[PDB]
Each structure stands twice: as C-alpha cells, then as structure tokens.
C-alpha cells in the first residue's frame, strides 16, 4: 500500500483507505493513521472504530466520547432493523456491539488517582467474556488486538498462549508466528517456552527436538531440585 496514490482518483483513494488504515494500526505506527482518516469517507462505522481507536491512543478524555456517542447514535438503526432475524444472522451484531461497549470501559481503565486497587476483579471481566465467546480465531485475534492496544502482552501473558494453543488446533501458520514472536519478545517464562516447544513438532522439526525438550527437562529439573506456593 506504499505505491498507490499516483493514479489513485478519490473515490477509490476512498475505497482503500479503511483496509490501508487497518494495516497501520497492525504495523503499529500512528502517525500515517492519521492521514489515511483524514482522506476516510465521511460517516462509516469502521472509520468510528479507528477514530476511536486514534483517540485512545492519543488518550484524549473529552471529544473521543462525543465520537463514541456518534457511534452509539448511529449503530441504532441497523439494530432494529437486524433484530428480527435469527440469532446467527445476528451474531455479527451482537459482537460488535459487545467490542464498542468493551472499549468504552477501556476508556473508563484510564483514571488518574492511583491505577493499583481495582486489579482484583476487573483484569478477570474480559478473560470470562472471552472464554465465554465461542473459539473463533479472527474475532479472538481482533479482540485480543484491541485489549493489548491499552494493556502489556508481557503482564498479558496469562492468556496470550491460551491464544497460540487453539490458533495451532486451527491449523494456520502466519498468525501462529505473529503470535509466537511477541510472545518471545531471555531464560525465564516457562510457559512461553512451553508454547514453542509444542510449535516446533506442531511444524515437523521433530528431530531437533528431541535432544532440545530432554535439555529443557533436564534444566527446569536442575532449578527445581533434582531429587510462592501456587507460584
């Protein structure tokens, strides 16, 4: 998407632009989101979302709600019209609804006075909502994606391999190894080692496996003893 704006005429500038939006936000880098809003449509939901998306970032407390309620205004619509269908037509809606309403308690994580007190039984509210949402991989990943943007996958990591776990039962490689290599960035974490030693044989690489997973053992057993409590 870095050589297409020569021959691009706006409507297909308009076009491209949400895909290309959405590519920024997964390379990671802000700036150029910008622009690629500025030259977004004038009402889409999914511009809603990245303007959203934007405002947390740039961690404003005061507009970023007016923006979120323009989202609530105009989603109304379509919620009645998708109402009297079946429940897995409706399915799709009641996701999204449920990631709009979950990131405006992401914006409500973000208090001033001290951050530390409300850990014990907030932290625990998305883990129960997403293991009770079925396993599906793309609105795991875009939700995972959405919780990491306000929280660290390092201090995350109690459900970040729970995630590579059932990305590999799926069956698919590219996410396995954008999930694997944030997941690695020394000689700690015991779990997250665990998850490339299932990955490896996973890929086939059974061979140099087998000297590898009797060292691991062999360590683990060293620093355990060889012949803080849930800890």
């Not at 308009?14 to 622009?35: R, S, T, V, Y």
């Not at 799926?170 to 700690?188: C, F, Y």
Request: proline content about 3%; glycine content about 4%.
């Amino acid at each position: 998407a870095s050589e297409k704006w020569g021959t691009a005429k706006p409507e297909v500038k308009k076009a491209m632009a949400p895909l290309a939006a959405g590519a920024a936000w997964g390379l990671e880098q802000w700036d150029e989101i910008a622009q690629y809003t500025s030259v977004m449509k004038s009402q889409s939901p999914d511009k809603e979302f990245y303007d959203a998306i934007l405002c947390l970032h740039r961690n404003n407390f005061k507009k970023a709600e007016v923006h979120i309620f323009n989202a609530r205004d105009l989603l109304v619509t379509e919620l009645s019209a998708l109402v009297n269908e079946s429940y897995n037509r409706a399915y799709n809606v009641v996701v999204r609804a449920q990631i709009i309403a979950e990131l405006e308690e992401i914006i409500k994580y973000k208090k001033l006075p001290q951050n530390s007190d409300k850990r014990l039984t907030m932290r625990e509210t998305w883990n129960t909502r997403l293991l009770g949402c079925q396993k599906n991989i793309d609105v795991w990943q875009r939700i995972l994606r959405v919780r990491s943007l306000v929280i660290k996958p390092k201090e995350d990591a109690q459900v970040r391999i729970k995630f590579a776990n059932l990305c590999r039962k799926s069956g698919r490689m590219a996410l396995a190894k954008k999930v694997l290599n944030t997941l690695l960035e020394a000689k700690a974490s015991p779990p997250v080692v665990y998850a490339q030693l299932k990955y490896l044989w996973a890929t086939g690489l059974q061979d140099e496996a087998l000297k590898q997973l009797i060292n691991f053992t062999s360590r683990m057993a060293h620093d355990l003893g060889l012949d803080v409590p849930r800890h």
